[PDB]
UniProtKB/Swiss-Prot annotation, chains A, B:
Catalytic activity: K(+)(in) = K(+)(out); Na(+)(in) = Na(+)(out)
Activity regulation details: Inhibited by extracellular acidification adopting a nonconductive conformation at pH 6.0. Inhibited by phorbol 12-myristate 13-acetate (PMA).
Impact after mutating residue 92 to C: Abolishes voltage gating. Conducts currents with linear I-V relationship characteristic of classical leak channels
Residues bearing carbohydrate: 52
Sequence similarity: Belongs to the two pore domain potassium channel (TC 1.A.1.8) family.
Region (Selectivity filter 1): 92-97
Species assigned in the record: Homo sapiens (Human)
Side of membrane Extracellular, spans: 29-87, 101-106, 174-188, 202-212
Protein name listed in UniProt: Potassium channel subfamily K member 9
GO cellular component labels: dendrite; mitochondrial inner membrane; plasma membrane; synaptic vesicle
Record's keyword terms, sorted: Cell membrane, Cell projection, Disease variant, Glycoprotein, Intellectual disability, Ion channel, Ion transport, Membrane, Metal-binding, Mitochondrion, Mitochondrion inner membrane, Potassium, Potassium channel, Potassium transport, Sodium, Sodium channel, Sodium transport, Transmembrane, Transmembrane helix, Transport
Consequence of substituting residue 97 to D/N: Impairs channel inhibition by extracellular acidification. Does not affect channel ion selectivity
């Protein structure tokens, strides 16, 4: 029927898109990865030769460094750290900066995610719908001062998304002393609920315990961006769902 | 109105849930984190004292080890690695095992995610609807051999989810030599599109290049679990959306 043809076309398009993306990523990153691996191997070989580090102790040092990486940013299991972890869990971001080490803790986290994901999704959908209604009312008032089409709403939403991304990138560049492009990429990754974890905020000089205002601003910005993303998805994506 | 009261109640419930989760996580993980940090500091101090490692070179060693961690699993930017990265990107998992190192690569990844997320969501929704229809038909045929209620469908979906999770956990425990509970936790994390990245498959002894069958099975299992999760969300969660 129509549904079978539609889903077959969707599957074929998804497979072709995946193949094209994999080919482009390989062709763009193979040489860079090879050069980085060669440089790292040369550096580690030189360091091992200079310090005469035993092979057996090298694995222990690597394990210790890997396990102590989250602890180098301070205490990640305080009230602020626990709140950040809960926010990441409920939003399905998965930064990976801190993970439970207890089986009971893992089970509690699983139950927490199960009981919290639908509630967060419903709240985000409602907030996005309310924001869309408010934006439509504001646009109508502006037009009266100076009917609304779907293209105008789409353009307004895209402009709002771009402005929010630019504001977040500028704020993160000013706070964490990051590059503008890097801050923009990190903001885009955070707002898409992907969570690569390469760039994690509130992980420098113990900012989670000495800068409550920065933490509050980051939480507010994350919530606002998530609401904007949900509103945009409702405006453009949810229409093709049912 | 009703919508304002509903969204205010949702926000209050979400805030209370976040506070409770943060309090429980802190009370459960503070002592464990303190003990782990103390043990790691003692071990690193002992190693530094034994090897007389200079403080300046310690930072260089830490940076080299952190940068070379993905490369220890083999070549992560081959065809299989690029396909895995694209699959993680389109599914918003964000494992974080491999990340782009080029600005052009980052921009391409951002555009890829933007152009692929709605398509993947639509395909998953259609596949979940088709699976729900097939399950309803199978249940009707079974009942005839031996009308259907919503509670029966919910129970069948929950049982299917539990069976899929158990099968995935058993397969991952048999393949990667992981614990049953750890495999179950990793499967749950992967199927919820959260992606902590603590446990990543296809990262041992170069399995991405020597075991094509294992990679294909992992891809099929991930797709099947994502389809099951989408079908369950459509059955129980999507009803409260609109
Ligand atoms: C800025 C961002 C949010 C843009 C997102 C783009 C989407 C609006 C596009 C991208 C992929 C598109 C889909 C790609 C393939 C198809 C299959 C297509 O089916 C057919 O052509 C056969 C069945 C029929 O005749 O309807 C129906 C539209 C649909 C779901 C498309 C709907 C619109 C989608 C989701
Ligand atoms: C309507 C649009 C166009 C503009 C929105 C206003 C912004 C320009 C404001 C609103 C909130 C502000 C932020 C609120 C809180 C903080 C934390 C603040 O941090 C501290 O005070 C402690 C750390 C330090 O000493 O820098 C630094 C500024 C910043 C990011 C502010 C930067 C400027 C922001 C983004
Ligand atoms: C309807 C909307 C606008 C409600 C918004 C609520 C915010 C005003 C609240 C919710 C969560 C709060 C945060 C939750 C946790 C913390 C950690 C907390 O840190 C500590 O308790 C330890 C460090 C210290 O002693 O300050 C400082 C306040 C802060 C950032 C809070 C600041 C105020 C926040 C952002
Ligand atoms: C195993 C998993 C799939 C469980 C998923 C649980 C959901 C089915 C629950 C969890 C939170 C619930 C929501 C929590 C709060 C509210 C607000 C509530 O609104 C009111 O009480 C005021 C308005 C009115 O009177 O209807 C309406 C139901 C709703 C959306 C609930 C609908 C059902 C939800 C999404
Ligand atoms: C209907 C339900 C109840 C059962 C579904 C059947 C499973 C028991 C089968 C179907 C697919 C099978 C998997 C397909 C592919 C592989 C890869 C295979 O790996 C290799 O052959 C190479 C690595 C090695 O040497 O172990 C190991 C078995 C495994 C996980 C299989 C384990 C058994 C599985 C999960
Ligand atoms: C309608 C549904 C059932 C379609 C299912 C398609 C699968 C049969 C395809 C899609 C993606 C394929 C995989 C894409 C990439 C790779 C990596 C590839 O590895 C290499 O090319 C290098 C190593 C080697 O030389 O084998 C081996 C095959 C494999 C696992 C493929 C196996 C077959 C897969 C799972
Ligand atoms: K993630
Ligand atoms: K990570
Ligand atoms: K996600
Ligand atoms: K991650
Ligand atoms: K994620």
């Amino acid at each position: 029927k129509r549904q079978n043809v539609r889903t077959l076309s969707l599957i074929v398009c998804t497979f072709t898109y995946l193949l094209v993306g994999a080919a482009v990523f390989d062709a763009l990153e193979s040489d860079h990865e090879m050069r980085e691996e060669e440089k790292l191997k040369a550096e580690e070989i030189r360091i091992k030769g200079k310090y005469n580090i035993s092979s057996e102790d090298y694995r222990q040092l690597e394990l210790v460094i890997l396990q102590s990486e989250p602890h180098r940013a301070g205490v990640q299991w305080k009230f602020a750290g626990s709140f950040y972890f809960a926010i990441t869990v409920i939003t399905t971001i998965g930064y990976g900066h801190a993970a439970p080490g207890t089986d009971a803790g893992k089970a509690f986290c699983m139950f927490y995610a199960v009981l919290g994901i639908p509630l967060t999704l419903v709240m985000f959908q409602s907030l996005g719908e309310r924001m869309n209604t408010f934006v439509r009312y504001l646009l109508k008032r502006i037009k009266k001062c100076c009917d609304v089409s779907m293209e105008n709403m789409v353009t307004v939403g895209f402009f709002s998304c771009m402005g929010t991304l630019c504001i977040g990138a500028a704020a993160f560049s000013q706070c964490e002393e990051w590059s503008f492009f890097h801050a923009y990429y990190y903001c885009f990754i955070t707002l898409t609920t992907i969570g690569f974890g390469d760039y994690v905020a509130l992980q420098t000089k113990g900012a989670l315990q000495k800068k409550p205002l920065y933490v509050a601003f980051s939480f507010m910005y994350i919530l606002v961006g998530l609401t904007v993303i949900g509103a945009f998805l409702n405006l453009v994506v949810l229409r093709f769902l049912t």
